[PDB]
Amino acid sequence: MGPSLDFALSLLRRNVRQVQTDQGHFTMLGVRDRLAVLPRHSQPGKTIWIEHKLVNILDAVELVDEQGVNLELTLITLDTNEKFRDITKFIPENISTASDATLVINTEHMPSMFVPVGDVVQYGFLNLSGKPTHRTMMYNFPTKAGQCGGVVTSVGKVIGIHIGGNGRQGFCAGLKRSYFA
Numbered sequence: 001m002g003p004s005l006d007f008a009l010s011l012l013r014r015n016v017r018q019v020q021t022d023q024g025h026f027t028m029l030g031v032r033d034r035l036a037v038l039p040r041h042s043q044p045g046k047t048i049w050i051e052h053k054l055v056n057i058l059d060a061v062e063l064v065d066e067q068g069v070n071l072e073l074t075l076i077t078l079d080t081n082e083k084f085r086d087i088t089k090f091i092p093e094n095i096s097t098a099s100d101a102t103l104v105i106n107t108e109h110m111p112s113m114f115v116p117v118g119d120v121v122q123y124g125f126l127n128l129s130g131k132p133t134h135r136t137m138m139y140n141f142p143t144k145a146g147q148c149g150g151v152v153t154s155v156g157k158v159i160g161i162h163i164g165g166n167g168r169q170g171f172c173a174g175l176k177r178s179y180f181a
C-alpha cells in the first residue's frame, strides 16, 4: 500500500470519528489530547455520540475572526479516557491551498468515504445559509448533505473541514495550526 492511502486510512483509524448531534450525522476530527473540531452548525450540546457511546463535552469554543465573523468551526474538549494522536504538525500554520486533495468522510451513513475533490483554492467569504463566514476554501466538486465535518487532506497535510456546497462546488473551513495551540 502506498503512502497517501496509508495516511488517509491511518487518519480514519486514529483521528476521524463518526459522530451524532441533535443536528444529525457528522465527521469529527480529533486533533490532540482531548481536543476535537466540528463544523459549527452541528451544534454539539453537553454530550455527543461518538461511534459507540455518549461522551460528555467539557467545553465548546466557536471560532470567530478579529472582525467577529463566523469561521464555522467549534472546538470541543471531550471527557474521554483516550488522548487523540497529535496531528497538529500536519495542519499548516496558515490557511493553505492544495492540489488534488481528497475529502475524507466518516459517518455512520458514510463510513470511510473517499471523495476526489481535486484542487483546493482560496475563497474567503461565504454566505452559508444566511450566515456570513470567512476563511473558507473551495473545490470544484459537487459535495452533498451528510458530508459536513469531512476532512480535506493532501500529501500528509490536513487543511480543511467540509462545511457546505452549492451543488457544483464544495467549501471547507480552512485549518491553521494556531487554532489548536
Ligand SMILES: */C(=C/C(=O)OCC)[C@H](C[C@@H]1CCNC1=O)NC(=O)[C@@H](C)Cc1ccccc1
Binding pocket: 024, 041, 128, 129, 131, 142, 143, 144, 145, 146, 147, 148, 149, 163, 164, 165, 166, 167, 170, 171
Ligand atoms: C453539510 C451539513 C448537512 O448535510 O446538514 C443537514 C442538511 C452540508 C454540506 C452541503 C449540503 C449541500 N451540499 C453540501 O456539500 N452543509 C450544509 O447543509 C450547510 C448549509 C449547513 C449550515 C446550516 C446553517 C448555517 C450554516 C451552515
